[PDB]
Amino acid sequence: LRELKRLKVLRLKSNLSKLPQVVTDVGVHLQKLSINNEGTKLIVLNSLKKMANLTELELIRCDLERIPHSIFSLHNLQEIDLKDNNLKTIEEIISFQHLHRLTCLKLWYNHIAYIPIQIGNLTNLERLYLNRNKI
Amino acid sequence: LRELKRLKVLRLKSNLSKLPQVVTDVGVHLQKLSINNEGTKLIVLNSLKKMANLTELELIRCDLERIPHSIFSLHNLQEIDLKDNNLKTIEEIISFQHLHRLTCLKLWYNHIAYIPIQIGNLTNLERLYLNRNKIEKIPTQLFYCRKLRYLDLSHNNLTFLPADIGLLQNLQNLAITANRIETLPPELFQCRKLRALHLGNNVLQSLPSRVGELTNLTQIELRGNRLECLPVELGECPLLKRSGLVVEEDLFNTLPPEVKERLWRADK
Amino acid sequence: LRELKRLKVLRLKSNLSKLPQVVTDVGVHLQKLSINNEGTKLIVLNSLKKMANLTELELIRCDLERIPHSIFSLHNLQEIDLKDNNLKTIEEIISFQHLHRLTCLKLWYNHIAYIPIQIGNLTNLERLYLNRNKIEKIPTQLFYCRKLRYLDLSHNNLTFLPADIGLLQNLQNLAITANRIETLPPELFQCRKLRALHLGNNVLQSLPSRVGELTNLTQIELRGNRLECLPVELGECPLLKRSGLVVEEDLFNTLPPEVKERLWRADK
């Protein structure tokens, strides 16, 4: 994968235990990464900090169980999708306030019981999807 | 050929040493003659003077090296194309002042160093192409041609655009591509009728806010610049669409989401 | 041919050096004769005087080079067609004033430079076609022909329309296509009976409000202009429909939504 130096989009639906090192090595020019892990637990291992060029991230069906803090360094993010992570509390959004272009948050099909109050500091939001939850 | 009594257009691409006598004999009714000689020298021999009905003449790649003076008797000419004749000075255009329907002059890929001043007396011009030449300055007299719609000055050695560009009240589209212009004069926006402005692949450092005033803008080039963001006022253009705002995507992303939504609506 | 004693129409397209004697001998009962000689010179010679019953004459592509004077004795003529005779001056029309039923004169595709003034004495004219010629101006005397319904002056060298055009009270259709007219005189809308106006592919910058006065207008061309929007007063034409509003689509979009709604209902 190191030889494909102009790739802007990689999507993998491969039941992956971890994110490949080689993907994050190729992350210099990648713009959107999408992993559909089908409920298999994905390990991020801080490599994700290199993807400063990332504007849209989808970590789908990865049984993450925690919003990774590495997101907070990715100051260009516009969209996040967290399909199927059994999320009940989303307090970590307090630190999303520094992601100035974040306009679309997609947290469907989780076990969220309430919306934390700090959401009001996410003043740039244009799309918010919390459907199919326990609010 | 004499029996083909209704021929209104003849074009020949035949490596000709001279203009055939039979052509000028048939010139009673011919309206357009076009010769592409591919650099082979054409001899005219004054026979061309008989073609009183001619309205468009193209003597293409004939290595003429100077505009002949027989052309001035062709009082019906509307368009001239002088591709690839190594033209350096075009002062003779003063005698074109009597061609009242001359709207299009095509002089690309020559060695022209400057624009003669008498261009201001060609008041009926609508199209002027002087791109791909060696031009150093723009005379202000060009702007007496207030009915111009198309002006192409791309690929010259222009540094700035004079304020007198505000005088083209009938300008609609304009290309000054691939020069080293740093910023646009304000007077450019006196041309209210603009619909397209091709300025990409220059060294622009900033795009003025007054782009918001171009109501009828649908196409604009800004690509190939070291910009970090775009000005919000691009959203103020009513007839513009996402496909029409031709700019790098990372720069495009800087616009408000509302503008991008209106662009989404506009397309479908 | 002598045996066919009831023939009313003979047309010949046969590259004829002369008009046959036998045709003129059979001319007792013939009503319309048409010769298409394909540019071959036709010799009349004094026989044509017998065709007193002729009401319509077409001497087509006959390289005549002169209006034959024998026409002046043919007092029943209603229509004349002189396709392709390289005519530059038509002064002979002064004597057509005695042809009282002449309503249609067809002189296209010639080299006519001007209209002689005596045309005003052709007071019974209802159709006049001088299109595809070299005419530079309109004499006012043309407008004494107050029975004109159709006038075609497309593809000439006209710059303006005289105000005296208001005198054609019976005018219904009119084409001035492919000139360089910038604006229409208001007096043009004194011709109340207009139903179609083909003005496309000109350099018009504005369309006058007085188009509202054309009650019976159903078709009008505006294409090929530098408009940015369209004037609302076209909506003041009662019988106009979307199919009759002949204009570029981008310009059509500029009209008020109400006008487009009325056009939607009007069609179906």
Which residues does chain C have within 8 Å of residue B193's beta carbon, measured at their own beta carbons?
Answer: 226, 228
Residues B48/B50/B53/B55 CA torsion (nearest 10 deg): 20
CB contacts, 8 Å: A55 with chain B:
253
Rg over alpha carbons for chain A, rounded to the nearest Å, is 15
Is residue A36 a contact partner of residue A10, using CB atoms and an 8 Å limit? Answer: no
CB–CB of B209/B184 below 8 Å?
no
* A33: phi then psi, degrees, rounded to nearest 5: -120, 135
* Resolution rounded to one decimal, in angstroms: 2.8
Phi, psi of C26 (to 5 degrees): -85, 0
Q: C180 and B149: CB-CB below 8 Å?
A: no
- Cα distance between residue C224 and residue C220, in whole Å: 13
Q: Residue C139 has which token pair?
A: 């004499």
The residues in C 82-121 lying below 8 A from B, measured between CB atoms, are: 86, 111
> Cα–Cα distances in Å, from B131 out to B134, B153, B160, C6?
9, 4, 15, 70
Rounded (5°) CA angle A46-A48-A49: 80
Strand B56-60 and strand C245-246: the pairing is unpaired
Instruction: Give the residue from chain B lying closest to A100, CA to CA.
Output: B254
Vertex A74: Cα angle to A70 and A79 (nearest 5):
105
Q: Is A84 exposed, middle or buried (0-12, 13-18, 19+ CB in 10 A)?
A: middle
Q: How many residues make up chain A in this entry?
A: 135
Rounded CA-CA distance C71/C56 in Å is: 11
Give rounded-to-5 percent helix, strand, coil for chain A: 20, 20, 60
Q: Report the alpha-carbon distance of residue B176 to residue B188 in Å, rounded.
A: 12
Is C39 near chain B, with CB under 8 Å? yes
CA dist., res. C140 & res. B79, Å (int): 32
Distance from CA of A87 to the nearest CA of B (A): 28
Structure-determination technique: cryo-EM
The conformation of residue B249, written as its DSSP 8-state character, comes to H
Two structure tokens written together for A12? 């993998």
Instruction: Tell me the HSE value of C166 on the side-chain side, using a 13 A CA sphere.
Output: 10
Q: Is the dihedral of CA A49, A50, A52, A55 positive or negative?
A: negative
Element (H, E) at A10: strand A9-12
Q: For residue B231, which amino acid is it?
A: P
The span from the first CA to the last CA of chain B, in angstroms, equals 55
Q: Which residues of B touch A103 (CB under 8 A)?
A: 257
User: C-alpha dihedral over B71, B72, B74, B78, to 10 degrees?
Assistant: 90
Which residue is associated with the tokens 């039979």?
B22
Residues of chain C positioned with their CB less than 8 A from the CB of B172: 226
Q: How far is A101 from chain B (nearest CA, A)?
A: 9
Q: Which residue has the tokens 């690839």?
A: B84
Beta strands in chain B (DSSP E): 9-12, 32-36, 56-60, 79-81, 104-106, 127-129, 150-152, 173-175, 196-198, 219-221, 245-246
Rounded distance between C-alpha atoms, residue C243 and residue C90, angstroms = 39
Among candidates B103, B55, B60, which has minimal Cα distance to B84? B60
Nearest to B109 by CA among B78, B157, B69, B155: B155
State which amino acid sits at residue B252: F
- The H-or-E segment that residue B264 falls in is helix B257-267
What DSSP designation does C147 have? T
Distance from CA of B229 to the nearest CA of A (A): 13
CA nearest to B258 within chain A: A126
Burial of C185 (0-12, 13-18, 19+ CB in 10 A): middle
Report yes or no: B123 at the C interface, CB cutoff 8 Å: no
